[PDB]
Amino acid sequence: VEALYL
Amino acid sequence: VEALYL
Amino acid sequence: VEALYL
Amino acid sequence: VEALYL
Amino acid sequence: VEALYL
Amino acid sequence: VEALYL
Amino acid sequence: VEALYL
Amino acid sequence: VEALYL
């Protein structure tokens, strides 16, 4: 599970 | 922006 | 920014 | 579990 | 059970 | 955003 | 953000 | 059980 807020 | 690997 | 490895 | 707030 | 709120 | 695995 | 493993 | 509030 990856959440990238970029 | 946002990228999710769920 | 924010990156999570859950 | 990694939480990176960068 | 797995619940992701992202 | 939400993903549920039930 | 929340991730639950139940 | 694992609960992440991140």
DSSP B2: E
Closest chain G residue by Cα to residue C3 = G1
- Distance between CA E1 and CA A5 in Å, rounded? 25
**Nearest chain B Cα distance for residue E5, angstroms:** 10
> Pairing between strand B2-5 and H2-5?
unpaired
Do E4 and A1 touch, CB atoms closer than 8 A? yes
Pairing of strands G2-5, D2-5: unpaired
Cα gap E5→D6, rounded to integer Å = 21
- Tokens found for residue D4: 């990176």
DSSP string, E1-6: -EEEE-
Residue type, D6: L
Q: Which residue of G has its CA nearest to E3?
A: G4
- DSSP letter string over chain C? -EEEE-
User: What subunits touch chain C, counting only 3 or more CB pairs under 8 A?
Assistant: A, D, G, H
The sign of the torsion formed by the CA atoms of A2, F4, E2, H4 equals: positive
How far is Cα H3 from Cα C2, in angstroms, rounded to an integer? 19
Method: X-ray
